[PDB]
Amino acid sequence: VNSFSGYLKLTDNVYIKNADIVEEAKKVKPTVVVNAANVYLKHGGGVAGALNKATNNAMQVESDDYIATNGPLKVGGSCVLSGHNLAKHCLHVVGPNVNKGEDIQLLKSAYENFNQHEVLLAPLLSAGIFGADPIHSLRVCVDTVRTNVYLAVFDKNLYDKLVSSFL
Ligand SMILES: O=C(O)Cc1ccccc1O
Secondary structure, three states: OOOOOOOEEOOOOEEEEEOOHHHHHHHHOOOEEEEEOOOOOOOOOHHHHHHHHHOOOHHHHHHHHHHHHHOOOOOOOEEEEEOOOOOOEEEEEOOOOHHHOOOOOHHHHHHHHHHHOOEEEEOOOOOHHHOOOHHHHHHHHHHHOOOEEEEEEOOHHHHHHHHHHOO
């Protein structure tokens, strides 16, 4: 048993809810929250800008030190950093950004990072401002992640369409 509440069960291991991931993280304090990161860990908008704002910019300060030491992530890659006031850990995962021309086949590689963690609170990778088909992102999630994932869909109209189209 875990602390996640009000989720619709899609599969053995994937759950979904219409929720603000920031507000969900603040309530649950999950072991792992996933950030929709870019390779530079520049947290400006969407999930990253919202998560970073909720940490009072401490996520960005920590991220800048990580990049200064290690250089940029790979598209499809990840790193584990602090969850600050939101979670124990933040798994920063880089899905491909369609609005930068990145290979959508890298979305499966991105979701494979989730398998290193038994339970996660996450957004749909590459959805919204990343320019990919969200319905596609949910299918790749279900067909790739084997650990227990609680998806927070921010946009209500996107949530209802994802549920009503789910195979
Ligand atoms: O609603 C979601 O969860 C998907 C998403 C991600 C980023 C920006 C806007 C947006 O709708």
